[model samples]
Target: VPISPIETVPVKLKPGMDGPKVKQWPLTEEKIKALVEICTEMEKEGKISKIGPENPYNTPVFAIKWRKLVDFRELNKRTQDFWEVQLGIPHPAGLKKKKSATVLDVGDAYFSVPLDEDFRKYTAFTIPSINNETPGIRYQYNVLPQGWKGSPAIFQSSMTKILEPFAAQNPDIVICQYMDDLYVGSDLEIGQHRTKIEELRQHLLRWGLTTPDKKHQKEPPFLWMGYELHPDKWTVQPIVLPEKDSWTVNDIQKLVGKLNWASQIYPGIKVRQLSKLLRLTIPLTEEAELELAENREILKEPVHGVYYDPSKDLIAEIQKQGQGQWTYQIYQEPFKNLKTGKYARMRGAHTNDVKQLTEAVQKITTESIVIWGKTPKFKLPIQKETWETWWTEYWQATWIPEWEFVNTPPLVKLWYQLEKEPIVGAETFYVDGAANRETKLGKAGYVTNKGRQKVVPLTNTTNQKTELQAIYLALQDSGLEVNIVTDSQYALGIIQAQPDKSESELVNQIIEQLIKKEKVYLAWVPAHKGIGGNEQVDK
Candidate 1:
C-alpha cells in the first residue's frame, strides 16, 4: 500500500494596517511559481524529498526542532554583545544547537532482581516484590536518565561548584553552561587559551566527569541549551569527506579553522601555511596546489595540540627512563621502623632518596657527554663558554687580588711609597700596620727604590687606632695615578671621609691629611695566606 505525500500549505502575506491578520490562504502566482521552480530543481537534483511536508506523527519532533532553533537564536543574540565587547571578536551566527543532548547524571545503580531460594547462594541481595505473581516476573535494568525535568539545573549547579576555584583564579575565561553542554571562551591564541581549557578539564576530572572524546564530540560553533558559543579558533574538527582522495572545500575550511587555532599556540603556523590553503580553494592553481600539498604533509606530522605543555616534554623524558636505582645510606635508617626493622612510609624523605640507591655518576667531563645525578641519564655536551665565563668572574671577584698578596705584615709603608710613585702600569700597593698593646705608638714608613720614603707616627693610645692611623697616613700621601692600597677598609673610610664628617678625632685628622695630599686612592686587600710581593715588602 502506498501512502499519500503530505502537502505544504503556504501562508499568504496580506497588506493591512491592523494589529492581527489571518493565518491561511491559497498560494499566490509568484509563490506557486517559486515553489514549482524549487520542486523541479529538487527533482532534477535527486533531492525530491528534501522539502517534504510535515507528518502528523512528526509534529512533536518538529516542535522540538523549532524550539531549539528559536532558543539558539535568542542565545546568540544575548551573547553577541558580550563577545564583541569583551573578546573583540565578531559573534558567529552559524553554530547550531545540539539535537542529541547528552547530560551525564552521576548516580549509583542498584539491581532490581529477586533471588530464588535455590539461587540464593549465588545472589548477595534480593529485590522487594511489588505484586503477588511478581507482576509477570519483570527483571529491571536501572538507568538514571540525565536530561529529565530539573536535571539540567542540578547539573549546572554541580558544575558551577566544581569550576568556582578556576573562575576565581582566571578572569579571562568565559564559561556558560546549558544542561550538559559547556561553552567556554578564551582569547583564541593557543598559549593564552590552553590554560583556561586545561583548568576547565581538570575541574571536570575532579568532579568525576570526562569531556567527550574526539569521535563523540559535537561540532562547533555549538549551542549549549539556549546560548551560542563559537569553539576556540584552533580546535580541530572531524573531516567531512574522509573517503575523498583529494582535498575538498570542506577539508580546506576545517584545516583553516584548525590552523587558525594553532596559530595562537605556535604564533605563525596559520599565517604561514593557511594563506596558501585558502588560495588553493579559490582558484586551484598549480603552485597553490603544490604549496597546499606540502602544508598538508606538515600538518600530518604530529602537530602539537593547543593544550600541549612544553615543560612536560622534559618531564616526560625523565619519566620515560623509569625509576632510578636506590642507594642505601646511614641517615635513611632513622626514617625506617626500628622495631619492625622495615622501611618507614615517611612522606618526602622517600622521594628525596636520589643518591642512596644510585651508583656514582660517571661520564665525560669534556664536550662529548654529561650525566645527570638523578634518575634519568641524559647526555649533554659541555659548554666551554659557560665554564670560562663563570671562572673568569670568580677569579676577578675572589681569587686574583688575594693571589697577589703573600704576607701577614702591615701594608702602611708600602702604600705610602706607592702613593708617591708616578702613575704607571699597576702602580697600586695596598698596605697596613699592626702593633702590640705595649708598643701601640710607633713610626712606620716605606722606602721606594729611588731612595724616597715618608714616615708617620701613631700617637693614639689604643693599638687598633694606631694601626688605623698608619693606613690613613699612607692614603694621604698617594699622588695622581696611584692607588693607595691598604688592608683596612675601615681606615680607608676615615681617610676618604665618605660622609665628610669627623666621627672621631683620629678620623678627622686622617680626612684632613687626605684632602691636603690629593690625588691619592684607597683600596682594601685581603689579609694573610702567602701572596709573594706583599710578603717580600713585609720582610
Candidate 2:
C-alpha cells in the first residue's frame, strides 16, 4: 500500500503503429477463480482501475501454475524498452568479509512505483472471468505491469538511486539489489546485522518500499538467486532431467537453455556437448543420443563450486606464469564404470609430452588416489633438477610399470585364507619375497609341507616382481593338484588378470605354470606373522 512519492515515468512507445489486440486463451474454472481473486485484490488496493471496452489497446491475461499472469505481447511490441541497467550482484567469492547475510523480497515489488497516467490506456488488460461474469471487463494498471519488458530496467534504476543515501551512511554493509530481491551482507555479528536490517527496513519504508518477509536471515546454507551458497562451497539445486529416449529436438533446446543457466555454478559443463545438441538433426542418431546422455550426466549430481583459494601454492604458480607462454589441459583421471565397477583408463589431450606426463603423475599423487580400495605410495620430487631427472627416466617404459589389475570377479575362485589351516596330505607351499630398497635386487623363496625349500636370486626386480617369481617357482615345484599360499596381494592380482601382450613376462609365466596343473588354489596370508609356515617363508 506504500507508494513512492517520486514522479511516475511514462512508458514511451516506439515510432510505429500499435498491433491488434492479442486473443486470450481459455481458462479452467480453477484458473478463472485464481485470476478473479488476484484481480479483486489489485482493485481493492487501488493499484488497478476498471476501464471501458472502447480502448484500442488490450492484452490477454491468463493463469499459469495457479498464478495470474498478464500476457503483454501487444503492449511490448509498441512499448519502448528502458535503458539497460546493471542488475548483477557481487559473487559470493567477492563477499569474503561478510560473516553473515540475509535475503529480502519486496511485497508487490513491480507495483511499488506507479505508472504515468498518460500511458495507462496503452497497458490495459482483460481478465477471463471476474465475479463469475464474462470476459468483457477490462482493467488498466495504475502501477507498472509485471510482464512488461520495460519494468525491470526502470525499477532497478529507481531502486538504485533511492538506496544511494543509505549506502553512503553505512559503507561497511553491502546491499545487492536485483529487481525486487535485496541481499544484505554485514561484517558485524548477527546482533548488529539485525539492527542494520531494521534500519534498512525503516529506510525502505520511508521511501515506500515494503519488504514483506525475511526469506533468509544468516542461515548457514541457503539458496541465493537459485544458487545454493554454502559456507565452504557453492552448489546447485537438484534438477530432474527428462529421459533422453523420449526427448525431441525441442526438448534438447529446453535442456540447453536450462543447463546454460546452471552452468554458471557448474563451469565444468563442456561447450562441445551443448553444441552437439544445437547441431543435431531430428530422429536421434547414436552419436546424438550419447551426447544427450553426456549432457544429462554433467548435471546428474549437484556440482560444487571450485573457488580460487589465495593461500594455496597453485596461486603462486599461476602468478609466476604471468606474461610467459603457458598452456593448460583438462585431464580426468579414469573413473569407475557404474556397471562394471572397474576404472576406465585415464584420458586427456595435450601437445607437450612432458606436460602430459607431469599432469597425469600429479593428478594421481596430489589427490588421494584410490584404486581397488587400497592406497599406493608415490614419490614426487620438490626441486626442478631432481624432478627433471626422475620424470625423464620414469617414462622410459620400465621404471614404474603400468599395472592393469583385474577388476572382474576371479574365475579360479581364489580366497583370502587368512584364518584356515592347510589341508593335511595336500601339497601346500608358503611363499614370500623381499627386495633391497636401495639396491633393487631381490630374492623369491618358498617352503613346502614336505620339507622341500629353495631360494632364487633375481636381478633388476622390485618386491612386487619378486613375489610373483616366488609364486611361479612354488607352482612349478608343486604336484598336479596343489594349494599355493602367498602374502602378496600385488602378485595375486597380476596372476589372475587377463593376459596382455605388454604385461610382465613373469606374470604370464606364472599363469602358464598354473594352467598346466589339474587344479591350482591361491590363498593370501598375513606376512611377518609367527605362523610356522609363513615364518619359514619369511626367513
Candidate 3:
C-alpha cells in the first residue's frame, strides 16, 4: 500500500527542552533477536531508515508478547501539546436502528502517515550489539510512530479531512470513525450497506489508505468495538480471566486494565474486589501470592453479559403490555452453605417491611413464597424440622402483622427523638435483653442513671422480642421525659419506624408509650462495650 498524503507536523518542544535521551531498557537475548528481526522487516518495507549517531533524541523499546513497543514518556514530556481534534464517531447505541453495518480496519494506520523530514532525527533510537559478530545500530522512523503523545489527535484530524469528500458525496450512508477503525452502515438494506462500503473503500484507496482483507466484517452477529451486535440486543463478548500461578506488578496491571474495560461493558460485574486485589501490587510480597490465589478462585466464575437494547419499539410495546407493578424474582435452588454445612434458607420479603425477611414463610401468597429444598434421592426435608422447632418456640413473639384496613386509615403523625449522646436535664436509662435457646425464655432489664434498676421475665420469646419488652418496660415505668439507650439495631429500627403492624403486643405497647411521652429520646450504643448504664443493664 502507498503511504498517506497527510504528513506529520513538526514536533514543537517546551521551553529549554533541547532534546531528550532516554536509555533503552536491558532486554533478554531472545527479545533482542526478535527485535532485530522485526526492525529489519520494517526497514525492508521502507518504514524506517538507519541514521547517524549524532541525534540527541532517543527512547527505550521493550517487547511485550513478542510485539516491539517504544517508550516515549521522556520525549512526550518535553514536547508541547497540540490542539485536540474530535473524531465525530457516533456512540455504539446510535447504530441500533441501522439494518446492517460493515466494519473495516485500516492497515498501518499510524505508520502510514509520513513524518516531516526535519523531525525524523528526533525519533532515532539505538539497538545493542549481540556478542562480537553484530554491532549496535541507530534508526529513525520515516513515518509517524506509535507512543508519541500527539499521534492519535494528528491521525484523527488527517482521517477526518481525508474522508470528508466521500462523507459529503454519500449522505445516506452512516459513517463512523475512531482513528483508523471505521464503520459503514445503512438503514435501507444490506444491499445498500455493501454498496456504500465498496464506494467508501474506493474513496479510501484514492487517499492511499488500505483496509486489511482479514479485518473486513460484513455479516450479522457482528463484533464491533468490543460488543457483539445481534438482531435484537447488543452484548459484550465472553469473559476470559487471565491465568497465571504467579503474577508480577505488570501482570497485575494488565489484569486490572482488562477487568476495568470489561466492567464498563458488562454493567452488572461487581469489581469492588479489584481495589483490595490491586493492593497486593504494593511491595509485591509473598502475601500477594496468597491473596491472588484466593481472588483467582473467586474470578473463576465466568462473568455473563446483560444483553439490552432500549429501542423505541421495545419500550412502547412493554409499556402497553404491562398491566400492574412488575415484580422481578430471581430464584435459585437451595444450595449448601459450605461454611455452615447446611442448606441455605429460601428468603422472601414484603413491601411493608424495610428490613429483609430472614425467616421462611409458612403459606404461599401471591407476593411471597419460600420453597423448601429436599435432599438428593430420598428427598428428605433436612432443614424444615429445625426451622419449625424454633418457629413454634418463638411464634407468638415474632408476629409481623400485615396491614388490615377497613376504611381510610387514621394518620398519627410522629417524629423520632433520637440522640447518639446523653442530653442535659433528662435522666438517661439503658436497656438490654438476653435469651436462653434451650429454655426458650428471655429476660429484659433496664438501669437508670439515678441508680434505680428493674428486670422483667418473658415466656415464648426471642432476643429481639425481649429487647422490645425492655424498651416498653422502661418507658412504662415513668411518664417523665427521658432518654432510653438500647444496643440492638433491630429494636432501634422498629421503634423509630413505628410500623402500624408492630410485630407483637409488646412492640405495639412500646410504640404507644413512646408516642405518649413528652420528650423521650431513644438512642443506640455498642453492646457490652464499657458504657456505664449499658453495662449495668447487660449484667
Candidate 4:
C-alpha cells in the first residue's frame, strides 16, 4: 500500500500506547514547539527548570522510516558462526531491519526535556523552533532526547556502556552487535555460555535497557544476523531485493573504462559504475535514461542497470528480451581482465567473437608496450586473461634460458623468442634486492655464480633504488650474455622507458648495456615469486 505520512504530538510509544505505523513516517517536516500546560506540568513537577535559556535551540522532529537504507551484507558475515545470540525490539510493523540485528529500534520517533543540568543544557531547544510552535516556548531534555541534534550519535551509548564491562569480562568471547542486537559466541560449554549470556543481560538492564520477559532467547538454529536458518538450510527472512539501474550492460562497463581512462595510462577503483547519474552516465552509447521506479516522483525514475548482490545470490543472470522486430542479449559476469589484437593474442587470447574482441582492445589502457622487453605483465578485460598477461601459456612465463653451446653466436631470433617469456637462466646473471628502508640501509644482492648476495654497505634510499643498483652492478660487470634479474617489477616498470634522468639513471644505463649483451634475456621473475633465482620462481 502507498504510504501516507503524518505528524502527531511528541510521544514515545510505551507498551499499550499505540500510534501510526513506523514505516509510514517519512522525513520530513521535522520540528516545532507544542503544548503548554504539558511543559507547565513538567516544570512544576521539578522535571525541568523554568529558568531555562533565554533562547533554546528547538530541535526538529525527524521520523524517517527505514527504506532499506542499510547494508545487510555486513551483517551477513555471522551466518557461519557456530552459535549466536539475538536480542531486539518486536517485529516492527511494515518495515525492514537496517541491520537485522539492531535491538534498539529508533522507530523513526522523536522526544523532548531539561533546564539546569549540565548535560541537559545542550538539550534546551527554543521549542516551537522550526515547525513554528505558537506562543513558542523553551524546553530542554534532562537526558538525551530524540529529535535533538545529537540523538542519532548519542543513541549508541545505551548499546555501548554495557558492552565495555561485558567485553571486559568475556574479553575472549567472539561477540558482534548492531544498534540494539547483541550477539555473543564462545567455543565453551553450554553452561558457561548460558552463564556469560545471563551476566551480559544483567548489565544491559542496568544501563537503561532491558530485554522484556518475552523478547529474550538463549539460542536458535544459529542465531543469525541477516538470515534465519532452517533445520535443513537457511533463509533471508526480509527478502531484500536491491534496486538496480537497468541498462543492456555496456554503459556500466564503459563507465568503468571511462573512469579508468583516470589520467594514468595505468591504474584505479573500477566501481561497478551503474548507479550514479552524473559523471558515470556521460559516456554511455545511448543517452542513459534508466528508470527503476514507476512511481511518478521525479527522483523515482526507473533504476538503471541490473540489480544484484553476490552475498544474497542476487546475481545478474542472462537476460533475453526484445520487442518483435529486434532483440536484446544480456550477458553478465563479474568484471575481469582480457586482452586482444596485437598485445593480447600474445597472451594466447584469441577471439571467435570478433565484436567482443574489438570491444576488448578498446579497454586496454596500455599507452605503449616495451617491445621484446614484451615480457607482458597484466591481468584484466576477461577472466581468460588470468595472472600474468604477456605470455598466455604458463610454461612460457617460467622458461629458464640456457645457451645450447657456450659459443652460440648472439641470436636475434632466440632473443625475440625469449622476449615473450617470463624467466631466463645462466650464462645469465640474476640479481634481486631486499630493500630495508627501515635501516634506510636498503640491500640488493646479485649472483653471477651459486647466486651471489651483497649489501649496499649503507645507503639512505627506497627499496626501488636498491632494485636499480641490483640491476646496475649486474649489467655493469657482465662479460657476455646473462639475464640480470632484479626481482623488482616496480623498478622494471620504470625501466620500460629510458625516461630522462628519471631517478633510475643507473638502471637506464643498464637497460642499454643489457641490449649490448650477446643474448641478454632481462625478464621479470614476477617479484615476490620469481625464477629459480628469485626473492622464490614468481607466483
Per-prediction backbone clash count: 16, 0, 0, 45
Candidate 1 ranges beyond 4 A from true positions? 1-252, 259-281, 300-539
- Quantify how close model 3 is to the true structure by its C-alpha RMSD in Å: 15.5
> What ordering of candidates by TM-score runs from best to worst?
2, 3, 4, 1
Candidate of highest TM-score = 2
CA lDDT of every candidate? 0.34, 0.60, 0.58, 0.37
lDDT of 3 at 206: 72
Output the worst ten-in-a-row residue range by lDDT, candidate 3: 314-323
The digit string of per-residue lDDT tens for model 1 on 1-539 reads 33222221121212332111111123233443344444344346432222212211110001221121001221122211211112223212112222222222222211111112221111111111223223111111111112112223334444556667777788766655544456565545655565456666655655545675434545555443222333322223332223253546655655555544432222113223334555443335575555446545645543222221223211100011112211111111222210100121122211212211111222111111211112222212223342234334322331111011212221101111114344554345445455446755654443332334455555545545655655555555554344555555556544432322244666656555554553555555665655432322331
Q: Candidate 4 vs. truth: CA RMSD?
A: 20.3
- Model 2 residue 330 CA deviation (Å) reads 13
Against the hidden true structure, what lDDT does model 3 obtain?
Answer: 0.58
Candidate 2 residues lying further than 4 Å off, grouped into runs, are 1-4, 19-40, 52-54, 63-67, 87-90, 126-136, 213-218, 239-539
Q: How many residue pairs clash in model 1?
A: 16
The list of candidate 4 runs beyond 4 A from truth reads: 1-53, 60-116, 127-134, 147-162, 166-174, 187-195, 214-539
**After aligning candidate 2 to the native by TM-score, how far in Å is the CA of 387 from where it should be?**
21
lDDT of 4 by residue, 464-525 (tens): 67677777777777666566665677766654432322333565475566556665556766
Better of 2 and 3 by lDDT: 2
RMSD of each: 27.6, 20.0, 15.5, 20.3
What are the TM-scores, per candidate, against the unseen true structure? 0.21, 0.49, 0.48, 0.32
In model 4, what lDDT does residue 539 have? 12
